[PDB]
């Protein structure tokens, strides 16, 4: 119950990200859609291949490469989701680089995984663990701060349920995965407790149509619920 | 893994819809709310009157006229939802014209159903099938491209679960219906598997208040769950 | 089916709130997240202490002070949620004043509860009932129209399920509580019908990070599901 | 004006001061109440003597197992008895009975302490 206030001054970078997201919202059109993805097959697959990946590749894996490789597939078979507008031009790209958020002591630095489409689960985990290890002793450079075409911004380890993540430049669609909870879903005509997690997709209407984003989200949902679709070619 | 890009140039109309939605977002205030609507009575009613409407009117009906007539009723008994702002004026309107999205070979053309308030289910299906048949051989004119007061933009056939559709001019509230899924809902104190579908309502705060939109969405939910309310007068 | 329109002119205050929310959306960044809160313990606690609070303090209580005191706690233990930007300055504040919406005959007036952090349930209900009684005979002044740091805007009595309430000046985070419905949630490995209600949190990304808002919403969820946390100190 | 964790911080600091024998004289008086621990040692009832300069001492006791009838059926719920030795010169019997009932309601349900009853 005190009328005490202070005059704390922030740094330049807080204004940098603030003006960056302000210009991003004033340039792109904010527009979202959501869906729900079953993760029980992912639970069984990780629980059966934990020791296999540990003894084969030496590093620990979890919950992110499944979403990353599925997103890479959905960008390869729907190439307008990765395309952006630079003035009066649309840049279709065949290469896809997932722009991944991770924590750093200064704030939240965003390293980018390069050439993710021809790249397995364990190789994606090798690249992501290398980028996180570079962020561990603060060796993140400037050349890996741009060029991202998609984002799998982690909100799942922190405990969200829904979210509408702001589109950041220079990409055009950002999928914010969320935390896995318990919901007793009716499957095959009876009630069964299956752990799901909600997903988000904030997409520009200037280039991605609503049909495009809905089919895109359904394809990622089918690819994460069943990872045989990504080798099946649907 | 190739650094290959191209310089594809789009058409004038893509910039036309892009600048139109940009001015629509910069003019209207983006603000949404959602609800869930039981559709089991609609399932039973369609399953019992499929052959009746087929043998009486000759055309096939589905999933849209129930939402359209309920929206027409809710605009007749709450006339500030249809009203817009043109400068410093509020235009209350008694007539209601639902602006319906449908696919065309060039893109997504938006025909408008005229004088929908005094108009039954089968007459609405006659008008909508006539507009879709006009879009089949590409006979959509210019005079049926404006004047819409509401929108039942179809996202249900494509497989969405939630969405936040952008307010388009010259109307002020857009209900985006979504796909019907399976959720085991607790009704009357026990768990029962009833197929619902989520709805959206993106409404301007400059004219529609939050109370107005919440009561509006509840009234549409009651009108679609029970279509005796629309002749009951609530 | 009539082409009749009129030229009704609104008042100055409708343009005042319209331009206020337009400048608020053009200044702050619109960004939301949601969660679900169990209310069965709140049901039992209110059902067991209704006559106790009635015979001790003389006034009737419901559904709002639990959310208000939990929000006051979460602003005291996370002091960047209440802070705003006035130009190039961030104003951390120790005092918290919840800005509460309530109905008035002219429209929706917004009285503010002062010094809510060192203030019990019954004292908050005394202040809120005094402000509502002042709004009953239209005695709301000008000095209690500003200075709010948080908002528990009531959308629960009116019957909403989700919502994304617009950030209003001069605060930076608004929690819109919603109506309590029935959902049969899987708890402890079996299906149980527990009445929940969804919550919203529309927070600026210029000052509140996504991690901050997610932990903030989880802390309010834990404080409302279990009100021993607020004396426990978590 | 002091939470659970702050009370545990103060009590652990006083116990750590008693560990290397650093208890001073200034923290030996001025107490108004006493929660004299008889619970870790295994008592069931007790009548602790009022010590100066306070006027009421609650001696908490050990938690045992008793199958108590709650909501019309028999359920095994672990309780523990409490004591309250209070002067009749200032605390009346009504005052101490309502006091003990209020502490019982506050420990059985710790939402009462923020509820204000």
CA atoms of B112 and B147, how far apart (whole Å): 8
Can you list the alpha helix ranges (DSSP code H) found in chain A? 12-27, 40-57, 65-76, 121-136, 210-225, 229-232
D29 is catalytic: no
Taking the C-alpha atoms of residue B122 and residue B60, their distance in angstroms, rounded to an integer, is: 9
Phi, psi of B68 (to 5 degrees): -70, -45
A195 φ, ψ (degrees, to nearest 5): -75, 110
Phi/psi of residue D112, nearest 5 degrees: -70, -30
Rounded CA-CA distance C64/C83 in Å is 23
Chain B interface, mutation test: which of C161, C177, C178, C193, most B Cβ atoms within 10 Å? C161
Rounded to whole angstroms, how far apart are CA atoms A66 and A225?
A: 10
Give the side-chain half-sphere CA count within 13 A for B225: 16
Query: Tokens 């006009």 map to which residue?
Result: B134
Q: Active-site residue numbers of C?
A: 205, 209
Catalytic residue among B23, B44, B146, B209: B209
β-pair partners for B99: B112, B151
Distances (CA, A) of A203 to A197, B158, B163: 20, 17, 11
How many A×B Cβ pairs under 8 Å?
Answer: 88
- Tell me if C210 and A30 make a contact (CB, 8 A cut-off): no
3 state DSSP class of B217: helix
DSSP state of C56: H
CA–CA distances in Å: residue C26 to residues A163, A167, B29: 21, 16, 10
User: Phi/psi class of residue A180: alpha, beta or left (left: φ > 0; alpha: ψ in -120 to 50)?
Assistant: beta
Under DSSP, is residue A171 helix (H, G, I), strand (E, B) or coil? Answer: coil
Using the Cα atoms of residue A217, residue A218, residue A224 and residue A227 in order, give the sign of their dihedral: negative
**CB within 8 A of C48, min separation 6: which ones?**
none
Q: Which of helix, strand or coil describes residue A51?
A: helix
Question: Cβ contacts of residue A196 below 8 Å, gap of 6+?
Answer: A36, A37, A38, A39, A180, A181, A183, A185
Q: Give how far the C-alpha of residue B59 lies from the chain's centroid of Cα atoms, to the nearest Å.
A: 21
CA dihedral sign, ordered A161, A167, A170, A171: positive
Chains D and B touch (3+ CB pairs under 8 A): no
Closest-CA residue of A relative to C88 is A9
Q: Active-site positions of A?
A: 205, 209
Three-state secondary structure string covering chain D: CCCHHHHHHHHHHHHHHHHCCCCCCCCCCCCCCECCCCCCCCCCCCCCCCCCCCCEECCCCCCCCEEEEECCEEEEECCCCCCCEECCCCCCHHHHHHHHHHHHHHHHCCCHHHHCC
Q: Any residues with CB less than 8 A from the CB of C143 and at least 6 apart, and which?
A: none
Structure tokens at D67: 């199958």
CB under 8 Å to C198, separation ≥6 — which residues?
A: C34, C35, C36, C37, C161, C162, C178
Cα torsion at B61, B64, B69, B75 (round to 10°)? -160
Report the largest interatomic distance among the alpha carbons of chain A, rounded to a whole angstrom.
65
Work out whether the CA dihedral B59, B61, B64, B67 comes out positive or negative. Answer: positive
**Beta-carbon separation of A166 and C31 below 8 A:** yes
Going by C-beta distance under 8 Å and a sequence separation of 6 or more, which residues neighbour residue B153? A210, B100, B101, B165, B174, B175, B176, B177
Instruction: Report how far apart, in Å, the C-alpha atoms of A195 and of each of A47, B159, C68, D90 are.
Output: 15, 21, 32, 61
Distances (CA, A) of B101 to A57, B112, D55: 51, 8, 80
Look-up of token digits 């405990």: A159
CA proximity to A208, closest of A29, A2, A13? A29
φ, ψ dihedrals at A215, nearest 5° = -65, -35
Q: In what helix (H) or strand (E) does residue B212 lie, and over which residues does it extend?
A: helix B210-225
CB B113 within 8 A of CB B95: no
Q: Cα–Cα distances in Å, from A18 out to A8, A50, A155, A177?
A: 17, 40, 20, 23
d(CA A65, CA A126): 10
Find chain C residues with C-beta within 8 A of B95's C-beta: 1-4
CB atoms within 10 A of CB D94: 8
Contact call for C230 and D117, based on CB within 8 A:
no
- Number of other residues whose CB lies within 10 A of the CB of residue A189: 7
> Within 10 Å of residue B61's Cβ, how many Cβ atoms?
20
3-state secondary structure of B116: coil
Closest B-chain CA to A27 = B22
| Cβ–Cβ under 8 Å, residues A15 and C88 | yes
CA-to-CA distance for B195 and B181, rounded, in angstroms? 6
Closest among A71, A70, A35, A90 to A214, alpha carbons compared: A35
Extended beta strands in chain C, E state: 32-38, 84-85, 90-91, 98-99, 102-104, 107-109, 112-113, 150-151, 162-163, 173-174, 183-187, 190-194, 196-203
Physical contact, A and D (3 or more Cβ pairs within 8 A)? no
With CA atoms as reference, report the closest residue to B22 among B157, B230, B134, B166: B166
Q: Which two tokens stand for residue C81?
A: 């949620």
Q: Using CA atoms, how far apart are residues D4 and D110, in angstroms rounded to an integer?
A: 11
In sequence order, which residues have a C-beta less than 8 Å from that of residue A53 and are 6 or more positions away?
A: A59, A60, A61, A121, A122, A125
* Beta-bridge mates of residue B205: none
Preceding peptide of C71 cis, ω within 30°: no
**Under an 8 A CB cutoff, do A163 and C90 touch?**
no
* Contact (Cβ atoms closer than 8 angstroms) between residue C28 and residue C167: yes
Is residue D53 reached through a cis peptide bond, with omega within 30 degrees of 0 on the bond before it? yes
C16: part of which helix (H) or strand (E)? Answer: helix C12-27
All residues of chain A having their beta carbon less than 8 Å from the beta carbon of residue B25 are 29-30
Sign of the dihedral defined by the CA atoms of residues A112, A117, A119, A120, in that order = positive
Please report all neighbours of B, defined by 3+ CB atom pairs within 8 A: A, C
Query: Six-digit token pair at D61?
Result: 């006791």
Resolution value in angstroms? 3.7
Query: Taking a C-beta distance cutoff of 8 angstroms, is the pair C66, C42 a contact?
Result: yes
Alpha-carbon radius of gyration of chain A: 19
Q: Which residues of A touch B161 (CB under 8 A)?
A: 33-36
Dist CA B46 CA B61 (whole Å): 9
d(CA C222, CA B206): 35
DSSP element (H, E) containing C215: helix C210-225
Contacts 24+ apart (CB under 8 A), C3-12: C3/B95, C4/B94, C4/B95, C5/B91, C5/B92, C5/B93, C6/B91, C6/B92, C7/B89, C8/B89, C8/B90, C8/B92, C9/B88, C9/B89, C9/B90, C10/B90
Concerning whether B178 is annotated as a catalytic residue, the answer is: no
B32-41: burial string, b at 16+ Cβ within 10 Å, e else: bbbbbbbbbe
Residues in chain C closer than 8 A to D111 (CB atoms): 45, 227-228
Q: Are C31 and A166 in contact (CB under 8 A)?
A: yes
Q: Are B163 and A33 in contact, with CB atoms under 8 Å apart?
A: yes
The Cβ-side half-sphere exposure at B75, using a 13 Å CA radius, reads 30
The structure's method of determination equals cryo-EM
Q: Please say whether the beta carbons of A25 and C117 come within 8 A.
A: no
CB C155 within 8 A of CB C163: yes
Which helix (DSSP H) or strand (DSSP E) does residue A32 occupy? strand A32-38
Using CA atoms, how far apart are residues D35 and A3, in angstroms rounded to an integer? 37
Burial class (CB in 10 A: 0-12, 13-18, 19+), C234: middle
Cα B193 off chain centre by: 26
Angle at B22 between CA B199 and CA A23, to 5 degrees: 105
Shortest distance between the Cα of A199 and any Cα of chain B, in A, equals: 11
Residues paired with residue D57 on neighbouring β-strands, in sequence order:
D34, D85
Helix boundaries (H) for B95-173? 121-136
Burial tier of D73 (Cβ tally within 10 Å: 0-12, 13-18, 19+): exposed
β-partners of residue B199 are B35
Q: How many CB atoms lie within 10 A of CB B146?
A: 12
Measured CA to CA, the distance from residue C189 to residue C52 in angstroms comes to 35
SS3 A123: helix
In sequence order, what are the beta bridge partners of B35?
B199
Interchain pair D115, C122: CB under 8 A: yes
Q: How far away is chain B from the Cα of A117, in angstroms, using its nearest Cα?
A: 8
Task: Find out whether C81 and C210 touch, Cβ atoms under 8 Å.
Answer: no
| CA–CA gap between residue D40 and residue D62 (Å, rounded) | 6
Sheet holding C173-174, edge to edge: A162-163, C32-38, C196-203, C173-174, C150-151, C98-99, C112-113
**A166 contacts C29 by C-beta, under 8 angstroms:** yes
Sign of CA dihedral C130, C136, C139, C140: positive
What letter would DSSP give residue A11? -
Which has the closest alpha carbon to A175: A62, A33, A54? Answer: A33
Residue D38 Cα, gap to closest chain C Cα (Å): 24
Query: Cis peptide leading into A170, omega within 30 of 0?
Result: yes
Cα-flanking dihedrals φ and ψ of residue A18, to 5°? -65, -50
Q: How is residue C171 written in tokens? A: 């605060």
Q: Considering only the C-alpha atoms of chain C, give the largest distance between any 2 of them, rounded to a whole number of Å.
A: 65
Look at residues B196, B154, B148 and name the one whose alpha carbon lies nearest to residue B173: B148
Nearest beta carbon to residue B29 from set C9, C21, C193: C21
**3-class DSSP state of A106:** coil
Dihedral angle at the C-alpha atoms of B213, B218, B224, B226, nearest 10 degrees?
-150
What DSSP assignment string belongs to A197-221?
EEEEEEE-TTTS-HHHHHHHHHHHH
CA angle A162, A166, A169 (to 5 degrees): 145
CB contact under 8 A, A164 and C92: no
Among A129, C20, A132, C184, smallest CA distance to B205 is for C20
Tokens describing residue B26:
């910069």
> Taking CB atoms and an 8 Å cut-off, how many pairs form between chains A and C?
85
Residue holding tokens 């206030």? Answer: A5
Query: How many C-beta atoms surround the C-beta of residue D47 within 10 A?
Result: 9
Q: What angle do CA C73, C76, C78 make, to 5 degrees?
A: 105
Does residue B170 have a cis bond before it (omega within 30 degrees)?
Answer: yes
DSSP reduced 3-state for B90: strand
The span from the CA of C50 to the CA of C108, in Å, is 28
SS3 helix, strand, coil % of chain C, rounded to 5? 35, 20, 45
Q: What stretch of H or E contains A90?
A: strand A90-91
Burial of B19 (0-12, 13-18, 19+ CB in 10 A): exposed
């Amino acid at each position: 119950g005190t009328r005490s206030e202070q005059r704390v001054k922030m740094n330049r970078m807080r204004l940098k990200i603030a003006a960056r997201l302000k210009d991003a919202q004033n340039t792109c059109a904010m527009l979202t859609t959501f869906n729900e993805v079953d993760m029980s097959y992912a639970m069984d697959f990780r629980k059966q291949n934990l020791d296999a990946f540990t003894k084969k590749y030496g590093i620990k894996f979890g919950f992110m490469s499944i979403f990353a490789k599925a997103s890479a597939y959905a960008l390869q078979d729907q190439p307008v989701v990765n395309a952006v507008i630079d003035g009066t031009d649309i840049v279709y790209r065949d290469y896809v680089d997932i722009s991944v958020a991770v924590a750093t002591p200064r704030g939240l630095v965003v390293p980018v995984i390069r050439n993710v489409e021809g790249m397995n689960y364990a190789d994606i985990e090798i690249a992501l663990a290398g980028l996180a290890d570079k962020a561990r002793r603060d060796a993140i450079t400037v050349e890996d701060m741009d060029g991202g075409t998609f984002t799998i911004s982690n909100g799942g380890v922190f405990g969200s349920l829904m979210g509408t993540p702001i589109i950041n430049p220079p990409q055009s669609a950002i999928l914010g995965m969320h935390g896995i909870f318990e919901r007793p879903i009716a499957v095959k005509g009876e009630v069964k407790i299956r752990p799901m997690m909600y997903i988000a997709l904030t997409y520009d209407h200037r280039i991605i149509d609503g049909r495009e984003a809905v089919l895109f989200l359904r394809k990622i949902k089918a690819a994460v619920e069943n990872p045989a679709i990504i080798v099946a070619g649907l």
